[PDB]
Amino acid sequence: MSFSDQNLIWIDLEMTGLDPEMHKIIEMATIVTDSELNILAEGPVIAIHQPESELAKMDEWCTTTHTASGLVARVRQSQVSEEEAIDQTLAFLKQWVPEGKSPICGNSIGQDRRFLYKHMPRLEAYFHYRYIDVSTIKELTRRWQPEVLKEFSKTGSHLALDDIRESIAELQFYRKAVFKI
Ligand code: NA
């Protein structure tokens, strides 16, 4: 439909921790916007099954965060592996954006990309090599005109789809508040 090589792929992952070599992906969500940030389509929101031995690597922050959000229960009940989650996500993305065209979009999205390289390289390969990191603009705004940041806030629930929606909202806010294009 609105298929375009200008569309942007937004992605957020939840993990059992901060180290791709030790930890695992437990949730993935994708959203496609057009080049003007209008949300065209939301992709699969997938809790990825992990065994207790992997959930047992979570520290207090991860355990409490992902238990309170309901994600841990969804992970335990999930019947979807990483490979199946890749398959579902690629089947969605192919309907909206051509392969290799969109940068990876989100907040501190380099961290998610590290997990993709390690655990989902077939999905990492779908992105252009560049990164659209909304937190780059956050950090520049904090230094150049920090009072701007008081006009926007986030809930930060660590539910992957809700967090990526907040990433898009943050960039929409910067478009009006700190850009002149
Ligand atoms: Na994130």
Side-chain angles (χ1 to χ4, degrees), residues 12-13 107 112:
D12 188 39
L13 306 179
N107 281 102
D112 305 72

Side-chain angles (χ1 to χ4, degrees), residues 147-167:
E147 289 299 298
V148 160
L149 299 177
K150 305 240 189 67
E151 309 301 327
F152 184 83
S153 52
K154 288 189 177 180
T155 295
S157 63
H158 291 95
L159 295 177
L161 186 73
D162 287 344
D163 280 1
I164 197 68
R165 290 169 62 80
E166 294 198 300
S167 295

Side-chain angles (χ1 to χ4, degrees), residues 28-172:
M28 180 157 68
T30 46
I31 299 185
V32 173
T33 70
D34 68 15
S35 57
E36 298 289 326
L37 312 182
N38 301 303
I39 296 172
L40 303 180
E42 291 182 316
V45 178
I46 306 179
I48 296 175
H49 178 76
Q50 298 293 345
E52 290 306 312
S53 64
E54 295 291 338
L55 298 178
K57 298 190 187 180
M58 291 193 296
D59 69 356
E60 174 127 346
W61 188 95
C62 279
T63 296
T64 58
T65 295
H66 297 323
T67 301
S69 72
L71 182 55
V72 166
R74 287 166 54 201
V75 164
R76 291 178 163 145
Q77 298 151 4
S78 169
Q79 311 218 333
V80 185
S81 67
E82 285 95 333
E83 289 308 314
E84 291 155 346
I86 293 171
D87 289 341
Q88 284 194 44
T89 299
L90 288 174
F92 161 71
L93 294 173
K94 287 171 184 180
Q95 302 176 241
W96 295 96
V97 199
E99 181 169 17
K101 296 303 189 174
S102 174
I104 194 175
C105 305
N107 281 102
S108 295
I109 196 65
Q111 176 75 355
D112 305 72
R113 203 177 197 140
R114 296 171 73 208
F115 274 80
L116 296 180
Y117 279 118
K118 172 71 179 187
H119 300 280
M120 298 180 168
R122 250 201 315 140
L123 177 58
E124 190 282 329
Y126 206 82
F127 294 90
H128 188 267
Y129 73 85
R130 283 183 177 142
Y131 299 70
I132 286 174
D133 191 337
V134 179
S135 296
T136 290
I137 303 164
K138 186 206 305 292
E139 284 300 311
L140 295 176
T141 302
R142 197 187 64 76
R143 284 169 181 76
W144 296 342
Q145 196 168 123
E147 289 299 298
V148 160
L149 299 177
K150 305 240 189 67
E151 309 301 327
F152 184 83
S153 52
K154 288 189 177 180
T155 295
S157 63
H158 291 95
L159 295 177
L161 186 73
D162 287 344
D163 280 1
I164 197 68
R165 290 169 62 80
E166 294 198 300
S167 295
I168 295 167
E170 189 189 354
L171 188 57
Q172 284 278 42

